[PDB]
Design a binder for this molecule. Structure first.
Ligand SMILES: N[C@@H](CCC(=O)N[C@@H](CS(=O)O)C(=O)NCC(=O)O)C(=O)O
Ligand SMILES: N[C@@H](CCC(=O)N[C@@H](CS(=O)O)C(=O)NCC(=O)O)C(=O)O
Lengths: 218, 218
């Protein structure tokens, strides 16, 4: 039976995008059932008493250099902006994550593509992801029709959508999250929580699967 | 010619031990010149304004679980004691790092083994590494004679040894360190600083070498 792997992420998290692309490349290679869980990193940080690593000068500088190298190693078009702290702390990703939650509730088959497009806007093209038109553009590029995207956008402020995002974020905390991304592997009645996009080789080991690098063949 | 790769470490750092063993396993496989750089993590922490991650409850908990899994994946006999905080924040590793600095100055050929034995005491058997007799035990187990070990131990308080440790620690800070371990690769004019024991696959990519996992064919 395929092992269930849960990935908690926020589009505001560049490292979550990296982990997400690696798991998506392996979802049809490894015997796993990938379940995407849109969460709010702000909620996780507040609950754990943690703070964004970029607030400390040297860590912020390191992130920039690290992401620059990972762009080539992982072959993910990430272009980290110099004013990333403003993007993270001043703008945020509330509407975007509420939108992805609505997508997960009514059109889950579109969640992977819709998520990738939002990440592409904020961390690849340095485009806005807080305004309605911005989210609509991302949704349409993901394949949704103007009508579908519009219908979902109208529900981002409904109690059902808000409560679902809150619950998913709380589930991450219950697993012990202090940041994102976190991957939860359910292997033979055992649950393992791994933090970071750099624990995938360890995940392979736990699953008894073969690690073939961040870019597996075929 | 072989590419110079510098590894900055402190025996007080368990992750530094994991990074160290991986590089030691590859030092004769990849075209590199591994340079060990004994450093003080406390000095790096103070200089960067960072704090031990284990101080945050949820992260301290994660570290324990992470190291337990890495133990089997990397095949390193690491046993994280319940009171790791006391060993770190309280006891420290000053004398031990000054000792290794002395070893590096007069018996460089013994640095690798001396370093490993000290890690074995603190992170494997959970034994003391602050008292001279504790350090002597490690040095002798590493292959040094009581005469040699005793000789180096008498120099850990000399200005030459103190300044060398300070300078090496400062070099790590100048490279942008906010913690350990950090690996600095010198590849064709360019200098890349990588943080963590989990960036070794990326290092292989930068060096144009082949990554064969944490345990390459012996
Ligand atoms: N070395 C790991 C780091 C992940 C990370 O720093 N995640 C940030 C969020 S970032 O994507 O905005 C995070 O949640 N950090 C928590 C912490 O560092 O305590 C990796 O390669 O994925
Ligand atoms: N995911 C990396 C973490 C290294 C780490 O947390 N290092 C601590 C010291 S620990 O060995 O005592 C450190 O210096 N952390 C700095 C920070 O987390 O900001 C790995 O797998 O090596």
């Amino acid at each position: 039976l395929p092992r269930t792997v849960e990935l908690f992420y926020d589009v505001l998290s560049p490292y979550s995008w990296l982990g997400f692309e690696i798991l998506c490349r392996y979802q049809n290679i490894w015997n796993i059932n990938l379940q995407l869980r849109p969460s709010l990193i702000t909620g996780i940080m507040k609950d754990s008493g943690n703070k964004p690593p970029g607030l400390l000068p040297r860590k912020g500088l390191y992130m920039a250099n690290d992401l620059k190298l990972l762009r080539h190693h992982l072959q993910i078009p990430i272009h980290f902006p110099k004013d990333f702290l403003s993007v993270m702390l001043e703008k945020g990703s509330l509407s975007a994550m509420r939108f992805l939650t609505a997508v997960n509730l009514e059109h889950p088959e579109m969640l992977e593509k819709a998520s990738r497009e939002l990440w592409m806007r904020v961390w690849s093209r340095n485009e806005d992801i807080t305004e309605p038109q911005s989210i609509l553009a991302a949704a349409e590029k993901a394949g949704m029709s103007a009508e579908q995207a519009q219908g979902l956008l109208e529900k981002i402020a409904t109690p059902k959508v808000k409560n679902q995002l809150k619950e998913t974020t709380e589930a991450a905390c219950r697993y012990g999250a202090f940041g994102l991304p976190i991957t939860v592997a359910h292997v033979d009645g055992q649950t393992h929580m791994l933090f970071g996009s750099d624990r995938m080789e360890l995940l392979a080991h736990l699953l008894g699967e073969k690690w073939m690098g961040p870019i597996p063949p075929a």
